[PDB]
Copies of this chain bind each other. A is one copy, B any other.
């Protein structure tokens, strides 16, 4: 029957589109979790620079009275 063919394509289009909606939302969720981890490591990775240079300021300021 030629009329049922269209119906088969319509249901198939619905399923193929739903697969992409589900896959896209899942991959967005997982990769955004990964990048929140990334920005966490990024802010920590320059907070290390902040604290190293603070300790440089204090460690050389302890030598100020040995450089006056």
Contacts and interface: CB of A to CB of B under 8 A. Distances in A.
Interface of A: 15, 18, 20-22, 24-25
What's the dominant secondary structure at chain A's contact region?
helix
Contacts of A22: 18, 21-22, 24
A7 to B, nearest CB: 14
A15 B24 contact: no
The 7 closest A-B pairs by CB, nearest first: A18-B22, A21-B24, A22-B22, A24-B25, A15-B20, A21-B22, A22-B24
A27 to B, nearest CB: 13
A22 B14 CA distance: 10
Contacts of A21: 22, 24
